[PDB]
């Protein structure tokens, strides 16, 4: 029952270099290969101990069968290093570490700013919600009125700004005469920055 | 190099068969991997050397290869097999390559997104922002322009969006669109206008307000 284990998540700044270890669970019979996956893309093979021309040279990819750990470093990192790295075994790829978040961006630690965004004035249904701006880095969470309230939420996938900042927007619909009646509460969590807010959320004058 | 070709998307009703290609020259000579990636996990090998599965992997999954083509079929899909699914060989001269990968969606009737357009809030213009929202919910297909106007001025490069994944009750989608501008470009215009085009709707639906009236 061969598992692998990756090392922790890592912001680091354009120019610099970043090492990802991969832990297995006889690792002496098997090849180990690095896979990445920038956000939203395909997967990409990058190499094994043999490296993708695309990276030879800036990929150096080692092993200790001593501790059974195979090590990837990427050296010059760019904004379009920004991925998951992945460490697989050969057979094929049977076998997958979790994957190790590397986040390439000159931005600090910031929390969010949290506004809300109002239910319309003017039966039937309203939509509301917050608008969670400018964090960095990755991720926040957000729920409605402490877990109650999970039907018809949609939490949107964060976008990352020009400004190197993200920010996201959760929305709600709910019925339109429980609004002034039903307190509307989103709960964001920012734990880099240790942020936590909840926010009430009501219709304007 | 090699190089492994897939369509980006494939449709089917609940109950009935995926089918999923992989373009490659003599690709019926490789043996051919497949691997599901569910949103947020690390790919999962669900059919190797072609046809083989994995322990723990549904009878649903069989796969198929000779020719220029290798096929994963899925067969009576579920909500639950939304997902990414890549297919792989290995090359003697490329080492190890993937395919571009395929978005299994599941099909259901057309719905039209409902539509609502929320202005700056008075806490962010204090902060010297705007940020204008416009939320299209519970829409399928998944196709969807949004376009952006501000005193009728079509609005290019300065708006941002991203889509939830299918729901796993009812199989639609939600975006949200975002127009950034200052605060003080905020203050110079009345009507913020957001238009949106979808397969649901005969005409196209705009949701508007003018910047300080009970929107
Ligand atoms: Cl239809
Ligand atoms: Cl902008």
């Known amino acids: 029952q061969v598992q692998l284990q990756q090392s922790g998540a890592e912001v680091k700044k354009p120019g610099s270099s970043v090492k990802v270890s991969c832990k297995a669970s006889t690792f002496s019979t098997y090849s180990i290969s690095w896979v990445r996956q920038a956000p939203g893309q395909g997967l990409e093979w990058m190499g094994g101990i043999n490296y993708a021309q695309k990276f030879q040279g800036r990929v150096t990819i080692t092993t200790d069968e001593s501790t059974s750990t195979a090590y990837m470093e990427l050296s010059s990192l760019r904004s379009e290093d920004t991925a998951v790295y992945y460490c697989?075994?050969?057979?094929?790829?049977?076998?997958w570490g979790q994957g190790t978040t590397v986040t390439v961006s000159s931005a600090s630690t910031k929390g969010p700013s949290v506004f809300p965004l109002a239910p319309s004035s003017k039966g039937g249904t309203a939509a509301l919600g917050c608008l969670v701006k400018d964090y960095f880095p990755e991720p926040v969470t957000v729920s409605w009125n402490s877990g109650a309230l999970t039907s018809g939420v949609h939490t949107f996938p964060a976008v990352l700004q020009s400004s190197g900042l993200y920010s996201l927007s959760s929305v709600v619909t709910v019925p339109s005469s429980s609004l002034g009646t039903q307190t509307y509460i989103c709960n964001v969590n920012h734990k880099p920055s240790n942020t936590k807010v909840d926010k009430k959320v009501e219709p304007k004058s | 190099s090699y190089e492994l070709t897939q369509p980006p998307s494939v449709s089917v009703a609940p109950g009935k068969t995926a089918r999923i290609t992989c373009g490659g020259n003599?690709?019926?000579?490789?043996?051919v991997h497949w691997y599901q990636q569910k949103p947020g996990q690390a790919p999962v090998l669900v059919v190797y050397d072609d046809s083989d599965r994995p322990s723990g992997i549904p009878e649903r999954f069989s796969g198929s290869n000779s020719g220029n083509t290798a096929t994963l079929t899925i067969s009576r899909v579920e909500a639950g097999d939304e997902a990414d699914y890549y297919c792989q060989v290995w090359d003697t001269y490329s080492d190890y390559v993937f395919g571009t990968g395929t978005k299994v969606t599941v099909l259901r009737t057309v719905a039209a997104p409902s539509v609502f357009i929320f202005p700056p809030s008075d806490e962010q213009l204090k902060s010297g922002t705007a940020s204008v929202v416009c939320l299209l919910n519970n829409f399928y297909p998944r196709e969807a322009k949004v376009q952006w106007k501000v005193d009728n001025a079509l609005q290019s490069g300065n708006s941002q969006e991203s889509v939830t994944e299918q729901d796993s009750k009812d199989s639609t989608y939600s975006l949200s669109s975002t127009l950034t501008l200052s605060k003080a470009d905020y203050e110079k215009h009345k009507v913020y206008a957001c238009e949106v085009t979808h397969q649901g709707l005969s005409s196209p639906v705009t949701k508007s307000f003018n910047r300080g009236e009970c929107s």
């Open positions: 003599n690709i019926g000579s490789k043996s």
């Open positions: 697989a075994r050969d057979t094929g790829m049977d076998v």
